[PDB]
Amino acid sequence: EKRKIKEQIKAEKETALQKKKTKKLNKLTDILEQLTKEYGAEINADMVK
Amino acid sequence: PPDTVLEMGAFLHPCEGDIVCRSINTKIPYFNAPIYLENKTQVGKVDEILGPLNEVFFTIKCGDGVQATSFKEGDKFYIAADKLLPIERFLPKP
Amino acid sequence: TVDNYEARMPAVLPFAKPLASKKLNKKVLKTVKKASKAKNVKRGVKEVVKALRKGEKGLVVIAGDISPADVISHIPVLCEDHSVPYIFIPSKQDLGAAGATKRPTSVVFIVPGSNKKKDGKNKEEEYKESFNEVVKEVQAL
Amino acid sequence: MHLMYTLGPDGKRIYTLKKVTESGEITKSAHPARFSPDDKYSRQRVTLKKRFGLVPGQ
Amino acid sequence: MHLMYTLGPDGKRIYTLKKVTESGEITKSAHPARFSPDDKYSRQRVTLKKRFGLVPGQ
Amino acid sequence: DTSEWPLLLKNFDKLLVRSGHYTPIPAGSSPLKRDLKSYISSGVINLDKPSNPSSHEVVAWIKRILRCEKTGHSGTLDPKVTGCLIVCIDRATRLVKSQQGAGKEYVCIVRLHDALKDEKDLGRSLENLTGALFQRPPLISAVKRQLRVRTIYESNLIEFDNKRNLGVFWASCEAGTYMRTLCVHLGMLLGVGGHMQELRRVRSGALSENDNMVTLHDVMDAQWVYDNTRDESYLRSIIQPLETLLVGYKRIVVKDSAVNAVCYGAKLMIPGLLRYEEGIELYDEIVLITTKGEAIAVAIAQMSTVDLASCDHGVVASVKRCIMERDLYPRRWGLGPVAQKKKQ
RNA sequence: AUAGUCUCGUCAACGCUCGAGAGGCAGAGUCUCAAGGAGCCUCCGGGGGCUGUUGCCAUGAUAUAUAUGGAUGAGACAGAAGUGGCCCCGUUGACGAGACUUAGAUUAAGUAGGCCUACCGCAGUAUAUUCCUAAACACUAUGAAAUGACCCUAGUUGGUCCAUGAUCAUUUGGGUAAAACCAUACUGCAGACAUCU
């Protein structure tokens, strides 16, 4: 039973981290697309970092 | 006992001192093939093969000290790999 | 107006057996309405098939005027697989009306004890005798 | 759905928007049933249609 | 023997386990009489069936 | 008007006509108009076999009663079965297996070793045993006991008494199917156990119990009547021609001048073809009949319908097995126009 | 050599719903949505109407949202996961690759050798025989039947068989254990395009 509970907790943590990473990725690519549209050219990776 | 045994049947009900199993294996067993557990211990041998093609049943001839009433539903019964033969043999050839 | 029992008989599918008599149809519709008040009901092919697959026990009521017939043509043998009694009624509009929905439904699965609330338990206790006599009359067929 | 049909004397389809025709015959839904390739109820359908002779070629 | 039969409207046999049907008709045994190759009573059987026209040739 | 015509001549106007005109030869006879020796030597008995003797003993009894040169059967050797048994006499033995694809029918009583908790389950179990089935022949059967697949086409539970523990059911099955194994399997699926109490064959191939079934007393009484009275009517009544075994076969009518050549082993050609079935396919098994309705041979079709209708010459059929004797019809080959033209 | 067909992967041209995603379909898990509630008026605690073309959910689709639909469903998680579950245009020409052919469509009784043989078609025979003996199945002979006989941890009234012969004893005597086809050998009959008017 303890092993099953540990597996469920690990799965919940993994899917929460997946949701957070996808949210950050889509927000960053949206603001990057807006900045590229305003700038009119390609953006350097240093600005993204 | 063989090193590799495959799950053959699932318990259905006892019948006249024999164990009836619905086949959970795609292949057909040999006649008098020994029937095992996960512990590789023999409970008996295949007595009869019956049923339609979609739903095959087999009854196990129980050995000494093996009672059909001792087993419950959901128990799995195991067979050796070489004791299975393909179902295409019994069908007529094209 | 004309009752849906006599109205929907030409539309009844050939495999709709056993078909309820008019008194039996009225009793089944009343029991379905009481179960819907108890919220002890599964409506539609998806819910009924899922409840049958999980192992729920009760009574299955299937409409007869279903076109196309492949919507419900797997339900009766599936009920026989899980040892659940079933009966056919000719009207799906009456089945939907008794099943507490505005639009018609194809199949209704009365599952007693499917509500977690205590009020649902009390309603289950009050429709229990009607459910029992309906199930006995269906199995007597 | 809205498309309904009946069968004529020749056996061909007559398309109507009416649930009940003027002659009083109840119409049928023209569109076929929903299909999934992972359907697992061929045995049930075949058994039920075989109880009543509804299998084609039977 | 248990297998009994009665005659339907079409003339074919209806098989049953009952001595008397629900309509009240007495059922007949479906199995034939016991035969012995050393039976010596063909003359008696033929004469009695000719007296009542029960011979198939007659 | 052709529906009342007997045996293979039934509905002969439905046959497509290749040649409408021929000149008859006063040779042979109708199957029902044969002399008694030829009638018995080409005879088939649909017998109501009793329970106690086996089928081999019954066939030997019929051979001894009718003083045949041989008799035969192709029935399953389950003991205690009553009902339809097809006994072929002399030449008709070669058609002992002409109706194997037709199958058989049984009415069977199953005895259950215990009372079922649910009655309807028995019927459900029977519905589970309908279809292609895994069966092994019982110990009593002379066939080697290996696992085979046998098809039960349709079954129906007639009655069931749970207090008497007896269930009567009707089954239609492929040839080679054992009902003893079916009853044992029914008991195994029910779990109470069961076996076959009584068995009755109601149909064997084309012939059924309603198709002029007689008893062994009928055979012995008819032989006695013919021996002491010289009356053939009862013996002709109980004995059927072998053409009864050839119903359901596609028929080709052969000209009289082309009959005996087929009896000598010749292929049938287009000039000898007179009438034929709709839908004859290449390599089908067919029966060659005369204008009198007597069967010449079982043959294999070498042409299809278009070739049968529109080809001027060529092989129509090849003899698989000859029923008719040689020289019953005159030898008329070599007299046709094309053959005489090439000889000249 | 030439030419054709089949299986394929690229380019060009011309059309189309303009073709690879933050896509769709199928399937799995969780959650939401079905007038199941509330009020009023009648009838005999329940039944019938009214609020109610109301409410709940989804939908902007070439679009009326005062609309269209709702379990023979829709929506969110999900712009996710997964695809070793599938799907995402058509015609013509050219090029390249692998193959199969390069074909004029025969035969109104066959094939191969030295007039004759052998194979081929059909129909038969044989596939161990005699004597003694063991067993099985069924019958038959003699005696035994209504307080009939047999089986079961065994009866608030068990079950099965039974003059349509059960179940017992002696042996009274005979019967059955096939047929069809394959393979081998042998024997015989024919080589037949089917006129008859």
PDB file of C-alpha atoms in Angstrom, chain B residues 6-93:
ATOM      1  CA  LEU B   6       2.511 -19.839 -19.885  1.00  0.00           C
ATOM      2  CA  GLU B   7      -0.861 -18.962 -18.356  1.00  0.00           C
ATOM      3  CA  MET B   8      -3.401 -21.345 -19.835  1.00  0.00           C
ATOM      4  CA  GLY B   9      -6.762 -21.128 -18.117  1.00  0.00           C
ATOM      5  CA  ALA B  10      -8.917 -19.272 -15.638  1.00  0.00           C
ATOM      6  CA  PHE B  11     -11.119 -21.050 -13.107  1.00  0.00           C
ATOM      7  CA  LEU B  12     -14.810 -21.222 -14.001  1.00  0.00           C
ATOM      8  CA  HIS B  13     -16.469 -23.779 -11.664  1.00  0.00           C
ATOM      9  CA  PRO B  14     -15.936 -27.384 -10.524  1.00  0.00           C
ATOM     10  CA  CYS B  15     -17.738 -30.146 -12.409  1.00  0.00           C
ATOM     11  CA  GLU B  16     -17.907 -33.723 -11.048  1.00  0.00           C
ATOM     12  CA  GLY B  17     -14.496 -33.485  -9.405  1.00  0.00           C
ATOM     13  CA  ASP B  18     -12.925 -31.789 -12.435  1.00  0.00           C
ATOM     14  CA  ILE B  19     -11.878 -28.165 -12.878  1.00  0.00           C
ATOM     15  CA  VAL B  20     -13.474 -26.239 -15.746  1.00  0.00           C
ATOM     16  CA  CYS B  21     -11.370 -23.397 -17.129  1.00  0.00           C
ATOM     17  CA  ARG B  22     -11.992 -20.738 -19.709  1.00  0.00           C
ATOM     18  CA  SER B  23      -8.901 -20.593 -21.889  1.00  0.00           C
ATOM     19  CA  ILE B  24      -6.870 -17.407 -21.531  1.00  0.00           C
ATOM     20  CA  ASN B  25      -4.344 -18.729 -24.070  1.00  0.00           C
ATOM     21  CA  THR B  26      -4.655 -18.375 -27.835  1.00  0.00           C
ATOM     22  CA  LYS B  27      -3.324 -21.858 -28.571  1.00  0.00           C
ATOM     23  CA  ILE B  28      -4.882 -25.285 -27.975  1.00  0.00           C
ATOM     24  CA  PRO B  29      -3.321 -27.615 -25.364  1.00  0.00           C
ATOM     25  CA  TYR B  30      -1.983 -31.099 -25.913  1.00  0.00           C
ATOM     26  CA  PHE B  31      -4.036 -33.963 -24.531  1.00  0.00           C
ATOM     27  CA  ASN B  32      -2.992 -34.973 -20.986  1.00  0.00           C
ATOM     28  CA  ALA B  33      -0.672 -31.957 -20.806  1.00  0.00           C
ATOM     29  CA  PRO B  34       0.312 -31.164 -17.192  1.00  0.00           C
ATOM     30  CA  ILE B  35      -1.230 -28.083 -15.577  1.00  0.00           C
ATOM     31  CA  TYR B  36       0.898 -25.981 -13.231  1.00  0.00           C
ATOM     32  CA  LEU B  37       0.787 -22.937 -10.987  1.00  0.00           C
ATOM     33  CA  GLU B  38       3.125 -19.959 -10.721  1.00  0.00           C
ATOM     34  CA  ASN B  39       5.042 -22.083  -8.191  1.00  0.00           C
ATOM     35  CA  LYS B  40       5.668 -24.591 -11.050  1.00  0.00           C
ATOM     36  CA  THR B  41       3.803 -27.240  -9.016  1.00  0.00           C
ATOM     37  CA  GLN B  42       1.501 -29.589 -10.909  1.00  0.00           C
ATOM     38  CA  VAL B  43      -2.175 -29.627  -9.977  1.00  0.00           C
ATOM     39  CA  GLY B  44      -3.270 -32.041 -12.703  1.00  0.00           C
ATOM     40  CA  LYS B  45      -3.438 -32.669 -16.421  1.00  0.00           C
ATOM     41  CA  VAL B  46      -5.744 -31.583 -19.226  1.00  0.00           C
ATOM     42  CA  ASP B  47      -8.706 -33.954 -19.401  1.00  0.00           C
ATOM     43  CA  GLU B  48     -11.034 -32.471 -22.024  1.00  0.00           C
ATOM     44  CA  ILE B  49     -11.052 -29.643 -24.574  1.00  0.00           C
ATOM     45  CA  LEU B  50     -14.479 -28.255 -25.453  1.00  0.00           C
ATOM     46  CA  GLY B  51     -16.395 -25.189 -26.535  1.00  0.00           C
ATOM     47  CA  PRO B  52     -16.626 -22.988 -29.613  1.00  0.00           C
ATOM     48  CA  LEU B  53     -13.681 -21.425 -31.415  1.00  0.00           C
ATOM     49  CA  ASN B  54     -14.212 -17.974 -29.897  1.00  0.00           C
ATOM     50  CA  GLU B  55     -14.676 -19.331 -26.353  1.00  0.00           C
ATOM     51  CA  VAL B  56     -12.615 -22.451 -25.597  1.00  0.00           C
ATOM     52  CA  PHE B  57     -12.920 -24.289 -22.280  1.00  0.00           C
ATOM     53  CA  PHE B  58     -10.895 -27.173 -20.898  1.00  0.00           C
ATOM     54  CA  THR B  59     -11.383 -29.463 -17.914  1.00  0.00           C
ATOM     55  CA  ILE B  60      -8.377 -30.543 -15.847  1.00  0.00           C
ATOM     56  CA  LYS B  61      -7.985 -34.050 -14.452  1.00  0.00           C
ATOM     57  CA  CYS B  62      -7.058 -33.305 -10.838  1.00  0.00           C
ATOM     58  CA  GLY B  63      -4.247 -35.260  -9.231  1.00  0.00           C
ATOM     59  CA  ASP B  64      -3.905 -36.837  -5.815  1.00  0.00           C
ATOM     60  CA  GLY B  65      -4.586 -34.362  -3.031  1.00  0.00           C
ATOM     61  CA  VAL B  66      -5.817 -31.694  -5.467  1.00  0.00           C
ATOM     62  CA  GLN B  67      -9.471 -30.807  -4.896  1.00  0.00           C
ATOM     63  CA  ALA B  68     -11.613 -28.806  -7.311  1.00  0.00           C
ATOM     64  CA  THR B  69     -13.483 -27.114  -4.457  1.00  0.00           C
ATOM     65  CA  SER B  70     -10.242 -25.742  -2.991  1.00  0.00           C
ATOM     66  CA  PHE B  71      -9.754 -23.380  -5.935  1.00  0.00           C
ATOM     67  CA  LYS B  72     -11.656 -20.109  -6.296  1.00  0.00           C
ATOM     68  CA  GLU B  73     -12.674 -17.988  -9.267  1.00  0.00           C
ATOM     69  CA  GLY B  74      -9.876 -15.948 -10.798  1.00  0.00           C
ATOM     70  CA  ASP B  75      -7.222 -18.587 -10.139  1.00  0.00           C
ATOM     71  CA  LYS B  76      -4.842 -18.974 -13.071  1.00  0.00           C
ATOM     72  CA  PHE B  77      -3.573 -22.327 -14.325  1.00  0.00           C
ATOM     73  CA  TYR B  78      -0.352 -22.597 -16.302  1.00  0.00           C
ATOM     74  CA  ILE B  79       0.888 -24.858 -19.093  1.00  0.00           C
ATOM     75  CA  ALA B  80       4.274 -25.535 -20.643  1.00  0.00           C
ATOM     76  CA  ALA B  81       5.131 -23.802 -23.907  1.00  0.00           C
ATOM     77  CA  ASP B  82       5.741 -27.010 -25.868  1.00  0.00           C
ATOM     78  CA  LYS B  83       2.346 -28.382 -24.807  1.00  0.00           C
ATOM     79  CA  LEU B  84       0.507 -25.836 -26.958  1.00  0.00           C
ATOM     80  CA  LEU B  85      -0.316 -26.401 -30.618  1.00  0.00           C
ATOM     81  CA  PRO B  86      -1.775 -23.835 -33.046  1.00  0.00           C
ATOM     82  CA  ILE B  87      -5.509 -23.678 -33.682  1.00  0.00           C
ATOM     83  CA  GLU B  88      -4.927 -23.549 -37.467  1.00  0.00           C
ATOM     84  CA  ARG B  89      -4.207 -27.301 -37.427  1.00  0.00           C
ATOM     85  CA  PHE B  90      -7.764 -28.298 -36.489  1.00  0.00           C
ATOM     86  CA  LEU B  91      -9.312 -25.988 -39.082  1.00  0.00           C
ATOM     87  CA  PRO B  92      -9.566 -27.486 -42.598  1.00  0.00           C
ATOM     88  CA  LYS B  93      -6.762 -26.619 -44.984  1.00  0.00           C
TER      89      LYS B  93
END
